[PDB]
Every structure is written in structure tokens, then in C-alpha cells.
Design an enzyme around this catalytic site. Structure first.
Site, PDB file in Angstrom:
ATOM      1  N   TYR A 183       0.865  -1.175   0.000  1.00 16.90           N
ATOM      2  CA  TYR A 183       0.000   0.000   0.000  1.00 16.90           C
ATOM      3  C   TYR A 183       0.907   1.231   0.000  1.00 16.90           C
ATOM      4  O   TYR A 183       1.849   1.278   0.801  1.00 16.90           O
ATOM      5  CB  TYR A 183      -0.979   0.086   1.188  1.00 16.90           C
ATOM      6  CG  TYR A 183      -2.416  -0.032   0.687  1.00 16.90           C
ATOM      7  CD1 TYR A 183      -3.018   1.006  -0.016  1.00 16.90           C
ATOM      8  CD2 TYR A 183      -3.145  -1.177   0.897  1.00 16.90           C
ATOM      9  CE1 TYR A 183      -4.324   0.898  -0.482  1.00 16.90           C
ATOM     10  CE2 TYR A 183      -4.440  -1.319   0.417  1.00 16.90           C
ATOM     11  CZ  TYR A 183      -5.016  -0.278  -0.282  1.00 16.90           C
ATOM     12  OH  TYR A 183      -6.301  -0.440  -0.757  1.00 16.90           O
ATOM     13  N   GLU A 199      -0.483   4.792  -0.683  1.00 13.06           N
ATOM     14  CA  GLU A 199      -1.303   5.980  -0.965  1.00 13.06           C
ATOM     15  C   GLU A 199      -0.443   7.216  -0.671  1.00 13.06           C
ATOM     16  O   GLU A 199       0.388   7.155   0.240  1.00 13.06           O
ATOM     17  CB  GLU A 199      -2.577   6.043  -0.149  1.00 13.06           C
ATOM     18  CG  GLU A 199      -3.524   4.900  -0.463  1.00 13.06           C
ATOM     19  CD  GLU A 199      -4.530   4.736   0.650  1.00 13.06           C
ATOM     20  OE1 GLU A 199      -4.107   4.561   1.810  1.00 13.06           O
ATOM     21  OE2 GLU A 199      -5.723   4.805   0.337  1.00 13.06           O
ATOM     22  N   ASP A 248      -5.441  14.559 -25.095  1.00 16.27           N
ATOM     23  CA  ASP A 248      -5.414  13.130 -24.753  1.00 16.27           C
ATOM     24  C   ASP A 248      -4.607  12.439 -25.846  1.00 16.27           C
ATOM     25  O   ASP A 248      -5.127  12.119 -26.937  1.00 16.27           O
ATOM     26  CB  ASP A 248      -6.822  12.595 -24.629  1.00 16.27           C
ATOM     27  CG  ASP A 248      -6.938  11.127 -24.296  1.00 16.27           C
ATOM     28  OD1 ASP A 248      -5.925  10.405 -24.276  1.00 16.27           O
ATOM     29  OD2 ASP A 248      -8.084  10.683 -24.047  1.00 16.27           O
ATOM     30  N   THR A 262      -2.446   6.880 -22.152  1.00 14.44           N
ATOM     31  CA  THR A 262      -2.337   5.512 -21.675  1.00 14.44           C
ATOM     32  C   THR A 262      -0.824   5.251 -21.681  1.00 14.44           C
ATOM     33  O   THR A 262      -0.097   5.926 -22.422  1.00 14.44           O
ATOM     34  CB  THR A 262      -3.062   4.525 -22.585  1.00 14.44           C
ATOM     35  OG1 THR A 262      -2.703   4.786 -23.941  1.00 14.44           O
ATOM     36  CG2 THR A 262      -4.573   4.660 -22.444  1.00 14.44           C
ATOM     37  N   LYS A 289      -0.330   1.080 -25.655  1.00 11.68           N
ATOM     38  CA  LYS A 289      -0.569   1.536 -27.014  1.00 11.68           C
ATOM     39  C   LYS A 289       0.736   1.812 -27.742  1.00 11.68           C
ATOM     40  O   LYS A 289       1.641   0.961 -27.659  1.00 11.68           O
ATOM     41  CB  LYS A 289      -1.583   2.678 -27.138  1.00 11.68           C
ATOM     42  CG  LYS A 289      -2.968   2.167 -26.693  1.00 11.68           C
ATOM     43  CD  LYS A 289      -4.008   3.280 -26.728  1.00 11.68           C
ATOM     44  CE  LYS A 289      -5.311   2.651 -26.268  1.00 11.68           C
ATOM     45  NZ  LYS A 289      -6.323   3.687 -25.885  1.00 11.68           N
ATOM     46  N   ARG A 314      -0.479  -1.787 -19.176  1.00  9.34           N
ATOM     47  CA  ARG A 314      -1.785  -1.113 -19.254  1.00  9.34           C
ATOM     48  C   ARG A 314      -1.982  -0.178 -18.061  1.00  9.34           C
ATOM     49  O   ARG A 314      -1.918  -0.604 -16.906  1.00  9.34           O
ATOM     50  CB  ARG A 314      -2.843  -2.196 -19.376  1.00  9.34           C
ATOM     51  CG  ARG A 314      -4.250  -1.709 -19.688  1.00  9.34           C
ATOM     52  CD  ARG A 314      -5.123  -2.950 -20.013  1.00  9.34           C
ATOM     53  NE  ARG A 314      -4.584  -3.570 -21.218  1.00  9.34           N
ATOM     54  CZ  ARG A 314      -4.943  -3.235 -22.454  1.00  9.34           C
ATOM     55  NH1 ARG A 314      -5.875  -2.315 -22.661  1.00  9.34           N
ATOM     56  NH2 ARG A 314      -4.390  -3.816 -23.503  1.00  9.34           N
TER      57      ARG A 314
HETATM   58  C1  LIG Z   1      -7.500   4.224 -25.086  1.00 12.34           C
HETATM   59  C2  LIG Z   1      -7.884   5.594 -24.780  1.00 12.34           C
HETATM   60  C3  LIG Z   1      -8.397   5.973 -23.544  1.00 12.34           C
HETATM   61  C4  LIG Z   1      -8.715   5.132 -22.367  1.00 12.34           C
HETATM   62  O1  LIG Z   1      -7.801   4.171 -21.910  1.00 12.34           O
HETATM   63  P1  LIG Z   1      -8.118   2.940 -20.995  1.00 12.34           P
HETATM   64  O2  LIG Z   1      -6.819   2.399 -20.547  1.00 12.34           O
HETATM   65  O3  LIG Z   1      -8.800   1.926 -22.009  1.00 12.34           O
HETATM   66  O4  LIG Z   1      -9.087   3.424 -19.985  1.00 12.34           O
HETATM   67  C5  LIG Z   1      -8.676   7.351 -23.425  1.00 12.34           C
HETATM   68  N1  LIG Z   1      -8.422   8.173 -24.511  1.00 12.34           N
HETATM   69  C6  LIG Z   1      -7.934   7.861 -25.729  1.00 12.34           C
HETATM   70  C7  LIG Z   1      -7.764   8.935 -26.738  1.00 12.34           C
HETATM   71  C8  LIG Z   1      -7.644   6.474 -25.904  1.00 12.34           C
HETATM   72  O5  LIG Z   1      -7.154   5.976 -27.026  1.00 12.34           O
HETATM   73  C1  LIG Z   2      -9.114  -0.364   0.866  1.00 15.42           C
HETATM   74  C2  LIG Z   2     -10.502   0.063   0.767  1.00 15.42           C
HETATM   75  C3  LIG Z   2     -11.009   0.718  -0.348  1.00 15.42           C
HETATM   76  C4  LIG Z   2     -10.303   1.165  -1.572  1.00 15.42           C
HETATM   77  O1  LIG Z   2      -9.419   0.304  -2.238  1.00 15.42           O
HETATM   78  P1  LIG Z   2      -8.295   0.716  -3.248  1.00 15.42           P
HETATM   79  O2  LIG Z   2      -7.836  -0.526  -3.901  1.00 15.42           O
HETATM   80  O3  LIG Z   2      -7.159   1.270  -2.287  1.00 15.42           O
HETATM   81  O4  LIG Z   2      -8.872   1.800  -4.077  1.00 15.42           O
HETATM   82  C5  LIG Z   2     -12.387   1.019  -0.274  1.00 15.42           C
HETATM   83  N1  LIG Z   2     -13.083   0.646   0.864  1.00 15.42           N
HETATM   84  C6  LIG Z   2     -12.644   0.018   1.973  1.00 15.42           C
HETATM   85  C7  LIG Z   2     -13.598  -0.261   3.075  1.00 15.42           C
HETATM   86  C8  LIG Z   2     -11.252  -0.301   1.952  1.00 15.42           C
HETATM   87  O5  LIG Z   2     -10.639  -0.921   2.944  1.00 15.42           O
END
Ligand SMILES: *Cc1c(COP(=O)(O)O)cnc(C)c1O
Ligand SMILES: *Cc1c(COP(=O)(O)O)cnc(C)c1O
Lengths: 405, 405
Positions: A51, A53, A197, A223, A226, A232
Site C-alpha cells: 500500500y 497511498e 489526450d 495511456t 498503445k 496497461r
Molecule cells: C485508449 C484511450 C483511452 C482510455 O484508456 P483505458 O486504458 O482503455 O481506460 C482514453 N483516450 C484515448 C484517446 C484512448 O485511445
Molecule cells: C481499501 C478500501 C477501499 C479502496 O481500495 P483501493 O484498492 O485502495 O482503491 C475502499 N473501501 C474500503 C472499506 C477499503 O478498505
């Protein structure tokens, strides 16, 4: 693999099928690519257990000294690659990178101007069934009906009429270079922020084969997968003045803990992109797309915008009286992967379409060159011009197998 | 690893530092765990290369036959594990699982009732610097000031007064069993949906050591990591009647392409949780938490709620005149990882706090048992009762090293 085959035969058999499938097919879906073994090893690491954050040196939990080094490597290498003043490498995806910028500059119901979704805009650029379209008021600019090039006078007229708080430039299916300087000039005229973007073209931007949006945009999203050929996930680039707000938008704003193992993989991919061979790779991607475009025009196909300046092209299949859905299905029968894609001013719905989108990043990664592009175009011509001939389809299958080994 | 050490020495050295750190320290942060080699191998697979927007058999791209098998394995194993009618295994994180449920049932500005953030509620349960708090109107219910157990009359009074559209039950720092039946009874009284965020206790729920929220909640969210011991990511469980809306909320709603390699890892972790040894593991987690709680009370510490019914406990450090921040810092000096954590009715801010939160899932995974819990408590007593003695801290370091080898 060592432990997965014994712990989970079912999952292992499916992965092995997928691995073999990636090798046997000719991947022309423009968003796809094949990452290196080093990138996969980084995301297969023990960093999934931590973790973290917060940000490097400003974490909520102790023991983040070594994941801090990884995250900084990703941020600093991103900054060297794109020349940005700040990077946020925590976005879980391109969608979450966009969501965080929107969360930073917009209030609920604000007006946003983005590219028409039928002309190349992305789902996160205002689709009514996406959060973007539900949360904000999106208006769209289009491409010229004949040249299929963004109409910069239409961008400016829509901006002046609708007075968007934010203008979004870039696309998931636009085959020409985008003029970020004109987008910034229009944004300044109407007092709007500019968000670029660059997800599809980030690898080309990194290799200097596409103008860089960084100097013109307040915010750049992307991203890491790509054309950039990373794991990813997403990333946001921005000027120093929005760094603290962008970081807060990602966390505590829209996400929780970051995927540190994926961030390690982003750093790895950024290091690969900084090398000279990535630039040679990217040039082959664009060279191959030009070649493929030309070879397809040689087979009699019409291309949206008349060709391409980047890694992707769109075939307008109207002259062959085919929908993109029919072409995608028959190409799937021979081992060629494409996706149906609306074309500008498409008479068909987005579920049928009159086109197919094709990109060369994935086949370039596997070593294909100009001669392979000529053969791919010849196979597509054989198939799409003879959809009812099982003879022609079997020949195409054998020619596809000859390219993939 | 094979290719990462040669491609990227810097990233590899940092990962290796992190791996060794995970072994050398005593991890007591309640949200942490160590995943299996099979889970890591699944997320280190070539499935990162595949775009698979949509759902199994209903994808936007071709070639998803084998990633469909993986996703269905994850959904079906999740359903067997929790007895839910529907599962969505695409959420990138617990935060995105929550975001999607909120996107499904709420409109901007709707009222939501969740657990007071200082009493155990999560950031995504209405923090004003989180999207939840910005998008919606959150009101909170608290725990009793002396017993530290949720006051179900306070949940009901707040519900009847504020008329929330949604009630959220569950927490990131509540050491007792939550009565989901009472939450559903209150939700029904006021006509609100009930969402249970079981992220922290999902492994205990799966092993039958915590009442299952599935039969009582309209929606159940969770992380796949934490007590469930899966890869980092999220999941939503719900009844058949909300399946289509929940799936649409995840995609095209709030995310783009799913992380298929992480979904493969979720399936792997779900298969591990379905085995008898996971149930034995989970029992040791709760047994160890009870033992540790008792051993800490034996050292003179006061625990919030007087003990624990699950994997975590909170030490109220007021009797020792220490803040959670001081305790976290000195425990870090000896190799023991905890996090400061507000306690109910804490006189200190959330950045200082009067407590520390401790969980046993991670040390249980590494093989620690009751005798190790007694020693851990004895070390914490030595350190926190002698913060100014370098002698005591060096002894603690040697006792920590004796436990970790
Ligand atoms: C692919 C893409 C996204 C979103 O990416 P994810 O990883 O699929 O959420 C946003 N904008 C453009 C222009 C993209 O090609
Ligand atoms: C850890 C947690 C989240 C969020 O998880 P992430 O993977 O850190 O976004 C939401 N709710 C509860 C109750 C959690 O313990």
C-alpha cells in the site's frame, strides 16, 4: 511459468491459449502492442503487496522507501521523455487519467468541447453513456466532410459559441497530425483550458514523429500502453502550476492505493522508450502505416483522409458495398484482427459502421516491415473483394500463416 | 527474474530492495498481505497486451475467446465463494468498485449515509477531498462512545432524518462484526439501497468467519487484495436485478479497457480462497488477532471496543500519553510496520491521532502463530513503554530479527 501451471491448470490453459493466439494472428487493432519481457516481470513482482497511498516522500504508510524510488524513476523518465514539468504516473488507466483532469478543472455540468465521437473522439470525450457525458455538458467539433481533417474553423466557432471551460484535443481514430498550437490559440481566445489526450500517439510523440502537445496544453493525458508500448495504465503530464491539484485529483480525489507493480512496469517502458532503438521502432511504425496505406489504395480501397500521418488508418468500405462489421467478421475468419470503426459522416450506426480501423504498432513490434505491409494489404484485398469465396479465404489463411510462421 | 535485471538495473535494484524489506519487517498494517507466486505469475502474463472492453461473449473487439474464459472463471469462482448472483471483476480498485455503485444508484447531490470517517469509515465513504464527498451529500452514523460498537439506533435516526438514497455499511478500521441484517432492516424502513463495502473483511467472509453481506445488501463492493489475499484490484457483487446496470456502470460508465492479466490473477486468488487451506488460514488470522489483542491488553494497552472479532485491532494510546504518529515512528525504528489511526472521539487530528491500527493477515500468511503474537505484543510493550531508551529499541530490533529470521 512455474507455479501457475500447478496451482491453476484452468487459468494456465487459458493464458497459454491467449499467448499462442497473440503469435498466430496478425494484430491490426490500432490500440494494441506487445510489451517486453522486462515490463511483464515488473508487473509480476512483489510490489503488488504494498500500500502506498500518497506520493514519494509524502506517503500515508511507512516502508515506502523503495516503491518511492520506483515511482520517481517513472516520473523522472516520463519528464525526460516528454519534456513535461510534472508527471503523475498513478492513473489506473487512460480513462482514470482523463477522469482526474476533469475532476481538477471542471464542476458538475460545465461545458466541454471535444472531438465528435463519430469522427475520432474517444468514449471518455463526452459519450452519453460514459461519466464524461453524464457529468458534464459536452459539445463537439468535427472534421471536414471531404478531407476528413479537423476543421479548425469549426473548433473555433463551437468554442466561441459554447464557451467551454475546457477544450479536449486528440483521438482514438484520427489518422492525421493534430495541430496543438491552433488548439491552444483557440483555447486562449475563449479562456478555456486545453487538455490533449495523446493515448494513441504517445509513442510517436516520444520518438519525435508527432508534434508534442506538452508545450501547448495545460494538461496532457495518456495511456502507458498503445504506441508507447508500456503496461496497461494511465499517466497525466502538466505544468508545475497544476501539479499539486492534479496529484490531489488522483489521490485522495478519484483513486485509492496505486498499483506500484504496474508503476514499476511504466518506469521500465519509459526507460525502453528513451533508448535509440525505440525511436527506430517508432519510425518503422509510421513508415509501415504509410506503406500499408499506399498498398491498400493500390488494391482499390478508399482511406479516410486519403492516407495517414501516424500509426493508424481507416478504410471507408462504401465503395466495396461492405459494412465495417462484415469486413471485421470475414477478416477474423482468416486470422487478421481489425475492428469496425465509424467513419466521418457514416450513414451506418456505430454498431455496424462503414469502416475498419487498422494500426501497425503491434505488427511492427513483431518485426514486420514494408514487404510484410504489401502482403497484408494484398491479403485484405483478396478477402474483402471475395467475401463469398471459401477458396479465397483459405488462400488468405495460408498467406496469414506464412507471415506469422 | 530474468529480463528485468539486464534491461533495467535501477528498477530491478529497487524491487529487490522492496522484496527484501517485505521479508525483514514485521508487517502489521491491517490492509496488507502477501500474494502467492501463482497470482504474481498471472499478472506478469501476456494478458496485459489484450484490449477487451465489454464482457465475456459481448466484447467490442475480436480475439477475446481466451480472455473470456479467464474472466468467467473469475466471475464464477467469485459467485461460488460469496454466493452472489452476479459478479463484476473488472473494477481497477476498491475505489473504482465503490465509484461504479455510486454511479449506478445515485444522481449528483443525492444523500448518502455512511460510517463516520473518524470511527472506521473509508475515504470513499464521503471524505470532502474525495469524489464521494464532492459528488454526493454524505451524512454519518457513529459508534458508541464507550463500547465503540456501531450504534444501530444512530444509524436508524440518521437514516430517518436524512432520508438517504443509499446507506453504506462497512469499514477500513472497525474491529467488530457488522450486523448487515440490521443495516438492511433500516434501509428498508427508509427505502434506501444498502451497499456493503467488505474490502477489509472479504477473506473472512469467504472463509465463513464473518457474516456474509451478500444476502442482505443490494450491492457488495470489495478489494481483491487485503484479507482475500488477491492481486490489487476491485470487484462488485450484486443481485441479478442490478447486474446489467452494474456492468454498464463499470463499462462504458467509469472505466475503459479492463486489466485482463489482473483479472486472471483475481481468478487465481479466488481458486485459492475456495480451498480448505484458505479457510484454515483465515481462522488463524482471526485466532491470531484475538491472541495479539489479549497479549497487548496483558502489556497494559487499551484497545478500541475492548478487543476484536476480526483481523484487526486498534490501540488507544492515550493511557501511555502517546499519539499514534509517535508510536508509528518508533515502531518503524525497530522493524515493526503499523499505521497511526484515529480512534472514535479522538481529541487529535487525523494527521496525529491517538491510536495505531494493527492487523494479522500478513504475519499469518508468513506462518506466524499464537506464540509469535505473544512476542509481537511483548515487543510493542517494550518499545512503547520505553520510547526514550535506545537500549530498549535495540533489544526490540534483535527480537524482531529473531521472528523474521
Ligand atoms: C485508449 C484511450 C483511452 C482510455 O484508456 P483505458 O486504458 O482503455 O481506460 C482514453 N483516450 C484515448 C484517446 C484512448 O485511445
Ligand atoms: C481499501 C478500501 C477501499 C479502496 O481500495 P483501493 O484498492 O485502495 O482503491 C475502499 N473501501 C474500503 C472499506 C477499503 O478498505
Amino acid at each position: 511459468m512455474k507455479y501457475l501451471p500447478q496451482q491453476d491448470p484452468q487459468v494456465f490453459a487459458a493464458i497459454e491459449q491467449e499467448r499462442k493466439r497473440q503469435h498466430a494472428k496478425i494484430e491490426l487493432i490500432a490500440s494494441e502492442n506487445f510489451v517486453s519481457r522486462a515490463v511483464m516481470e515488473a508487473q509480476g513482482s512483489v510490489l503488488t503487496n504494498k500500500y502506498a497511498e500518497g506520493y514519494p516522500g509524502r506517503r500515508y504508510y511507512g516502508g515506502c522507501e523503495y516503491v518511492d524510488i520506483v515511482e520517481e524513476l517513472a516520473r523522472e523518465r516520463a519528464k525526460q521523455l516528454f519534456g513535461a514539468e510534472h508527471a503523475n504516473v498513478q492513473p489506473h488507466s487512460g480513462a482514470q487519467a482523463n477522469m482526474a483532469v476533469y475532476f481538477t478543472v471542471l464542476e458538475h455540468g460545465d461545458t466541454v468541447l471535444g472531438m465528435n465521437l463519430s469522427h475520432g473522439g474517444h468514449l471518455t470525450h463526452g459519450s452519453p453513456v460514459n461519466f464524461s457525458g453524464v457529468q458534464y455538458n459536452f459539445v463537439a467539433y468535427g472534421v471536414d466532410p471531404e478531407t476528413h481533417v479537423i476543421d479548425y474553423d469549426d473548433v473555433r466557432e463551437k468554442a466561441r459559441l459554447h464557451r467551454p471551460k475546457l477544450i479536449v484535443a486528440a483521438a482514438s481514430a484520427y489518422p492525421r497530425i493534430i495541430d496543438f498550437a491552433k488548439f491552444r490559440e483557440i483555447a486562449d481566445e475563449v479562456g478555456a483550458y486545453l487538455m490533449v489526450d495523446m493515448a494513441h500517439i504517445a509513442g510517436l510523440v516520444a520518438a519525435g514523429l508527432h508534434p508534442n502537445p506538452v508545450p501547448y496544453a495545460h494538461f496532457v493525458t495518456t495511456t502507458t500502453h498503445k504506441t508507447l508500448r508500456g503496461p496497461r495504465g494511465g499517466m497525466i503530464l502538466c505544468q508545475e502550476q497544476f501539479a499539486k491539484q492534479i496529484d490531489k485529483a488522483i489521490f485522495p480525489g478519484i483513486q485509492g492505493g496505486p498499483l506500484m507493480h504496474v508503476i514499476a512496469a511504466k518506469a521500465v517502458a519509459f526507460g525502453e522508450a528513451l533508448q535509440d532503438d525505440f525511436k527506430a521502432y517508432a519510425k518503422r511504425v509510421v513508415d509501415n502505416a504509410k506503406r500499408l496505406a499506399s498498398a491498400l489504395q493500390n488494391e482499390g480501397f478508399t482511406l479516410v483522409s486519403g492516407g495517414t500521418d501516424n500509426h493508424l488508418l481507416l478504410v471507408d468500405l462504401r465503395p466495396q458495398q461492405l459494412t465495417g462489421k462484415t469486413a471485421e467478421k470475414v477478416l477474423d475468419e482468416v486470422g487478421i484482427t481489425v475492428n469496425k470503426n465509424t467513419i466521418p459522416y457514416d450513414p451506418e450506426s456505430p454498431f455496424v459502421t462503414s469502416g475498419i480501423r487498422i494500426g501497425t504498432a503491434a505488427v511492427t513490434t513483431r518485426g514486420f516491415g514494408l514487404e510484410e505491409m504489401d502482403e497484408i494489404a494484398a491479403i485484405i484485398g483478396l478477402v474483402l473483394k471475395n467475401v463469398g469465396s471459401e477458396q479465397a479465404l483459405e488462400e488468405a489463411r495460408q498467406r496469414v500463416a506464412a507471415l506469422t510462421d
